[PDB]
Design a protein around this ligand. Structure first.
Ligand SMILES: O=C(O)CNC(=O)C(=O)O
Ligand SMILES: [Mg+2]
Ligand code: NI
Ligand SMILES: [Zn+2]
Length: 331
């Protein structure tokens, strides 16, 4: 078995290898990359997502989210308070203000220590989940707005045509902005490209060990666990590396820098934080290997998780028994 310790793998495709996205994902899996839950892909040196980032300031963040924490430094939840709209130029200036800017630090490890020590005492503002793309239409390789759609994959594998669309999302971050522990909707893959700015640190649990993380989360968030049998779908809970290590949960960590792709694999729990002002683009995707994960994915039916239009069909076709109850949660 390849990669039996479930280490995060880093790949350096050539420009020739960068042509066929599906083929390269399958290659990475042949080497065991999925066992980690997360892989890094450094694009060939000839490749670029677009020519410059000089003209992005007028993108609107219609509903910036202030991420307010509750709990203790290593075990906390966050809720998202909606703020007034602002442009990317306005948000960058905010991120660079004295109140919100990255503190002085020695290296990424020092900054990670400062994040876990101090995150809960601040409420950074995240421009998350903004439909759109920063890939130039002329970028033909690994253009996250030109991927094969999940609906077409389900149709190719299973023969059933379904409604729904699959488009990317932009994320504008600042110091301490945080993504809570989660897997993707329907335990899909994700791909994330860091277009610009400061790094993003990731934590990930191997898919084969995901239920260990779930069990710990039920212990650490016991009221949330009584409320919902899949409360990590709410995307609000944080657990630090120190607490994971104290409880024996297998995980790995890695820092993504501007110009790099990350792929999350089916049922790979992940969480992380931004180092400073940045912009990322991410989208879900599927392969044939996903189908079985989609069929077994947990679902929130308590009503909190509220997701896209397109997840309806996935539940309806892959999880017909759950359909009824899950849809009640969505309506
Ligand atoms: O970058 C972020 O805030 C969160 N991204 C992801 O969870 C992802 O790409 O799957
Ligand atoms: Mg603009
Ligand atoms: Ni994710
Ligand atoms: Zn729920």
């Amino acid at each position: 078995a390849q990669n039996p310790n479930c280490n995060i793998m880093i790949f350096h495709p050539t420009k020739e290898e960068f042509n066929d996205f599906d083929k390269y994902i399958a290659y990475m899996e042949s080497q065991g990359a999925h066992r980690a839950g997360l892989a890094k892909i450094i694009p060939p040196k000839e490749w670029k997502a677009r020519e410059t980032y000089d003209n992005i300031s007028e993108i609107l963040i219609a509903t910036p989210l202030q991420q307010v924490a509750s709990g203790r430094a290593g075990v906390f939840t966050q809720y998202h308070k909606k703020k007034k709209a602002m442009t990317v130029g306005e948000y960058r200036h905010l991120a660079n203000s004295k109140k919100y800017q990255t503190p002085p630090h020695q290296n990424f490890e020092d900054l990670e220590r400062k994040y876990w020590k101090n995150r809960i005492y601040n409420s950074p503002i995240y421009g998350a989940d903004i439909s759109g793309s920063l890939f130039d239409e002329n970028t033909k390789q690994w253009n996250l707005g030109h991927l094969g759609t999940i609906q077409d994959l389900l149709e190719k594998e299973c023969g059933v045509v379904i409604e729904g669309v699959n488009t990317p999302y932009l994320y504008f971050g600042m110091w301490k902005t945080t993504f809570a522990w989660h897997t993707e909707d329907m335990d899909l893959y994700s791909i994330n490209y860091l277009h610009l700015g400061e790094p993003k640190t990731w934590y990930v649990v191997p898919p084969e060990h995901g239920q260990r993380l779930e069990r710990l989360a039920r212990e650490l968030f016991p009221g949330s666990s009584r409320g919902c049998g899949a409360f990590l779908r709410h995307k609000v809970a944080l657990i630090s590396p120190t607490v994971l290590k104290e409880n024996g949960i297998p995980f790995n960590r890695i820092t993504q820098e501007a110009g790099e792709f990350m792929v999350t694999f089916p049922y790979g729990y992940h969480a992380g934080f931004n180092h400073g002002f940045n912009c990322a683009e991410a989208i879900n995707f599927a392969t044939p290997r996903w189908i079985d994960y989609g069929k077994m994915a947990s679902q929130c039916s308590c009503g909190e998780a509220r997701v896209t239009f397109s997840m309806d069909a996935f539940v309806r076709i892959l999880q017909p028994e759950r359909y009824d109850l899950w849809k009640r949660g969505q309506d």
